[PDB]
Amino acid sequence: EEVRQFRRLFAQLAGDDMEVSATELMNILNKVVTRHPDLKTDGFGIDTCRSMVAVMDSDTTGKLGFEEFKYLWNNIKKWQAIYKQFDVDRSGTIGSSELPGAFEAAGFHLNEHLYSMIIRRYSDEGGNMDFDNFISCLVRLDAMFRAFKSLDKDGTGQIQVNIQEWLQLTMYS
Amino acid sequence: EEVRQFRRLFAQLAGDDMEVSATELMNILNKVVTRHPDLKTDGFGIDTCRSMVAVMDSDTTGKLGFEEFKYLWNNIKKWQAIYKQFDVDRSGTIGSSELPGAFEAAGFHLNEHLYSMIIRRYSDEGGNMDFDNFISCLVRLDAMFRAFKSLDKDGTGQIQVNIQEWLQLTMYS
Ligand SMILES: O=C(O)[C@@H](S)Cc1ccc(I)cc1
Ligand SMILES: O=C(O)[C@@H](S)Cc1ccc(I)cc1
Ligand SMILES: [Ca+2]
Ligand SMILES: [Ca+2]
Ligand SMILES: [Ca+2]
Ligand SMILES: [Ca+2]
Ligand SMILES: [Ca+2]
Ligand SMILES: [Ca+2]
Ligand SMILES: [Ca+2]
Ligand SMILES: [Ca+2]
């Protein structure tokens, strides 16, 4: 079945310690993104991969276990289609005007100010965002949203943290 | 004088828009780190440089103005000496056991748990941290500390933020 062979794929990629490290993730991500040329990218760099891993490392093993990796993979599959769908000009990248729809389709409703911050940090001098940047951003964004909600189950619209929780959440990303 | 020629150096590097972008920073950082072989590194990647810039972008111009760049440069100069000083085994990298002293000398007192998170995210499979990782971490750490203090001038040991401040602070880094 599908679930069957994916479980094997993970075991195979995880290797010796049975979890996927940043280096492992980076290698598989690159090799795969190469088969999809319609997704322009300068590649997944090691640093970007270390951020995605840490931000996905809920059990703080330093690496990705099966579920974490599964969560991340599905997300990438989904965000991958949304990327192509919204690249209406077939530039291979997500433009400043295509982004909002892309993010919203993915399920993230941001306001003008947040979108501008996103462009500034994850898009190029031309307001364009390649694929590794797009995926990297959504992973982090999705994770920051979840972190917020979990610390505000009482839904007051505000979370309160001491300096150690803060550093943990901001440095481990 | 010294202040005189540094002001020229910035103007020269900033170029057309007169601020230093991530690409500009990355180029100057690399070219410089090359003259210092005692500082092992696989280089400053574009993504790492985009994080340092954003985290240093207090006025949100998307790039580094003179003061921001000056602040960052002094820090690097200082953290650069602390790096060499504490690399007692002349490995060219900062080891798991040399880190605490290095960070503390720099002025950051963390606890066992925070140090472990740091190693996990910024050190290699061998618990080693190269120079671009070391500088990158301190810049972010220093910035996260400042962000916390500014939001807690009443010194209650806690800061409270809504979802937009949160996303701004976590995504723009
Ligand atoms: O072609 C595939 O295997 C799939 S599931 C879609 C996909 C496209 C790009 C990446 I990177 C990862 C996954
Ligand atoms: O040799 C120099 O110019 C100096 S100030 C120290 C330094 C060393 C490494 C970096 I990257 C930046 C600055
Ligand atoms: Ca592994
Ligand atoms: Ca994990
Ligand atoms: Ca496009
Ligand atoms: Ca990229
Ligand atoms: Ca410039
Ligand atoms: Ca600025
Ligand atoms: Ca050392
Ligand atoms: Ca490095």
Swiss-Prot record, chains A, B:
Subcellular localization: Cytoplasm; Cell membrane
The keyword Repeat appears for this protein: yes
Residues with the N6-acetyllysine modification: K84
Subcellular location, principal: cytoplasm
BP GO terms, sorted: proteolysis
Binding residues annotated for Ca(2+) 3, in chain numbering: D87, D89, S91, T93, E98
UniProt-annotated binding residues for Ca(2+) 4: D42, D130
Domain EF-hand: 1-35, 44-77, 74-109, 110-138, 139-173
Gene Ontology terms, MF aspect: calcium ion binding; calcium-dependent cysteine-type endopeptidase activity
UniProt binding sites for Ca(2+) 1: A14, D17, E19, E24
Superkingdom as given in the UniProt entry: Eukaryota
Chain positions recorded as Ca(2+) 2 binding sites: D57, D59, T61, K63, E68
GO cellular component terms, A-Z: calpain complex; cytoplasm; plasma membrane
Record key words, sorted: Acetylation, Calcium, Cell membrane, Cytoplasm, Membrane, Metal-binding, Phosphoprotein, Repeat
Record bears the keyword Phosphoprotein: yes
Oligomeric form and interacting partners: Homodimer or heterodimer of a large (catalytic) and a small (regulatory) subunit. In presence of calcium, the heterodimer dissociates.
Entry remark concerning the domains of this protein: The contact of the 5th EF-hand domain from each monomer allows the formation of the homodimer and also appears to mediate the contact between the large catalytic subunit and small regulatory subunit for the formation of the heterodimer. EF-hand domains are paired. EF-hand 1 is paired with EF-hand 2 and EF-hand 3 is paired with EF-hand 4. The fifth EF-hand domain, left unpaired, does not bind the calcium but is responsible of the dimerization by EF-embrace. The first four EF-hand domains bind calcium, however it is not sure if the binding of EF-hand 4 to calcium is physiologically relevant.
Function: Regulatory subunit of the calcium-regulated non-lysosomal thiol-protease which catalyzes limited proteolysis of substrates involved in cytoskeletal remodeling and signal transduction. Essential for embryonic development.
Descriptive protein name: Calpain small subunit 1
Species, as recorded: Sus scrofa (Pig)
UniProt lineage: Eukaryota, Metazoa, Chordata, Craniata, Vertebrata
